[PDB]
Paper text:
To begin, we solved a 1.83 Å structure of [name] by X-ray crystallography. There were four copies of [name] in the asymmetric unit, forming minor crystal contacts that are not predicted to be biologically relevant, and each copy contains minor variations in domain orientation, indicating some flexibility. Together with previous size exclusion chromatography data, we concluded that [name] is a 23 kDa monomer in solution. The N-terminal domain contains three α-helices, followed by three beta-strands forming an antiparallel sheet. The C-terminal domain begins with a single α-helix that is separated from a six-helix bundle by a row of four β-strands, which themselves pair into parallel and antiparallel β-sheets. One face of [name] is positively charged, and the reverse face is negatively charged. The positive side corresponds with the site of positively charged sidechains distributed throughout the N-terminal and C-terminal domains, which have previously been shown to be vital for DNA-binding and autoregulation through mutagenesis studies. When [name] and Rv2827c are aligned via the N-terminal winged helix-turn-helix domain, the respective C-terminal domains differ in position relative to the N-terminal domains by ∼65°. In the [name] monomer, 16 identified residues were clustered at the C-terminus, forming a putative site for interaction. Overall, despite differing captured poses and discrepancy in size, [name] and Rv2827c are markedly similar in domain structure, fold and surface charge and are therefore structural homologs.
Residue numbers in the entry: 1 to 195
The structure:
């Protein structure tokens, strides 16, 4: 039955379950209310439930509420362990014209044209093990090169050096992105000093 499916999913999903997980499995969301009444899970945010062994995940909770926001810049660096800093704010990228409904205050929004909104998007686990959508390193570098003047100079230098030391560069992807984003020659000039 759908209840047995639901309970299997919770056990294998490390103690977090959402309304969207239910809709995806074809299970009425009121089943979560029933499990909450029984004490198996409890509600922490709108549509998000934890077991007694599930944990708060600020990145996953945020992207759950705002699924068009892709973690970018320092959030994308942090989530992929490309920096040692622990940011106290989110950097996200959304399509131009997107407005957040009741965002948190520790948020930097970056807008890009729809054609670029998912270029270099990839999925990685957060520090709490939940999958979120981020920009891969090559797309982060493109962003940094395009937007250098608007970026803290110490962060810019550190990030370029981190890519220089990154042993899993995908230069074909780097060049693909830079061509589409009209920044190939500045990216080639940047790469020259990092390899």
């Amino acid at each position: 039955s759908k209840k047995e499916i639901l309970l299997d999913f919770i056990e294998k999903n490390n103690g977090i379950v959402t309304n969207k997980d239910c809709k995806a499995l074809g299970i009425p969301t009121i089943y979560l209310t029933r499990l909450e009444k029984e004490g198996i899970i409890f509600r922490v945010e709108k549509g998000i439930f934890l077991t007694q062994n599930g944990d708060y995940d600020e990145y996953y909770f945020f992207q759950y509420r705002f699924p068009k926001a892709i973690f970018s810049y320092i959030s994308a660096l942090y989530l992929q362990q490309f920096t040692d800093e622990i940011p106290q704010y989110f950097d996200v990228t959304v399509p131009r014209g997107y407005r957040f409904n009741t965002p948190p205050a520790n948020l930097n929004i970056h807008f890009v044209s729809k054609e670029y909104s998912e270029l270099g998007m990839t999925t990685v686990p957060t520090p709490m093990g939940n999958n979120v959508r981020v920009y891969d390193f090559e797309r982060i570098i493109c962003d940094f090169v395009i937007h250098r003047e608007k970026i803290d100079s110490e962060l810019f230098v550190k990030t370029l050096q981190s890519y220089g030391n990154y042993p899993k560069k995908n230069l074909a992807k780097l060049y693909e992105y830079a061509t589409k984003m009209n920044t190939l020659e500045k990216v080639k000039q940047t790469l020259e000093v990092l390899i």
